[PDB]
Design a protein around this ligand. Sequence first.
Ligand SMILES: *[C@@H]1O[C@H](CO)[C@@H](O)[C@H](O)[C@H]1NC(C)=O
Ligand SMILES: *[C@@H]1O[C@H](CO)[C@@H](O)[C@H](O)[C@H]1NC(C)=O
Ligand SMILES: *[C@@H]1O[C@H](CO)[C@@H](O)[C@H](O)[C@H]1NC(C)=O
Lengths: 107, 107
Amino acid sequence: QLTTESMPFNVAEGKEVLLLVHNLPQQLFGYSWYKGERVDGNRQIVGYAIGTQQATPGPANSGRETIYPNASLLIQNVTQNDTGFYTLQVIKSDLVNEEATGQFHVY
Amino acid sequence: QLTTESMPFNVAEGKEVLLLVHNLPQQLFGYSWYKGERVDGNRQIVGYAIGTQQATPGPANSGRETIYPNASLLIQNVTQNDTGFYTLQVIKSDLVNEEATGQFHVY
Ligand SMILES: *[C@@H]1O[C@H](CO)[C@@H](O)[C@H](O)[C@H]1NC(C)=O
Ligand SMILES: *[C@@H]1O[C@H](CO)[C@@H](O)[C@H](O)[C@H]1NC(C)=O
Ligand SMILES: *[C@@H]1O[C@H](CO)[C@@H](O)[C@H](O)[C@H]1NC(C)=O
């Protein structure tokens, strides 16, 4: 049910892309975004804690990424290296968590 | 830094194994264990929420697994099909999370 949608899916080099998030579970503690197809701390872009309303960069943050309170992710000034897969994890209040994988293509 | 240790590493069929967790981070929301080498909600054994002090089974829970408040995981009555990889994820309060993959061998 949890899914992502890239706006736009095909992104011109140097422009921006917004990863929209649909069907968020109801009771959430926070969000974590990753580069790639896997939840992997070594590739985490950002973590967002809902109660403190706080965004914290992970190792893959480049200074171009913004996360919003509804879990959408904005990436500015995209490069060819940003192309491909991104994985969102949402942390539910029972710690039985959910993932969704999105994608965009820079040309 | 976060590591697991199988106690014992070689486990006789039908006996039990305790996955000890070392180097846990200080500020945490909870823990999640998975069967396999990936964080994947479809293979989640258990989620443990520190604030409500509650364990919640995931799809891979079989009734044989117990998680402790220090994140250690006890699996009773192992079979040869249980051998291999298990993954712990620790959810930090800033949502910059950490993983460790452990392993044991059933003989
Ligand atoms: C994106 O690139 C433009 C043009 O170089 C620059 O003005 C802007 O600050 C950049 N944005 C970020 C977040 O670095
Ligand atoms: C999430 O919030 C952003 C920023 O306000 C907004 O642009 C976007 O439409 C929202 N997402 C959804 C699915 O409504
Ligand atoms: C975690 O708690 C369990 C149960 O009290 C204990 O057996 C185990 O030794 C603990 N793990 C560590 C690393 O202290």
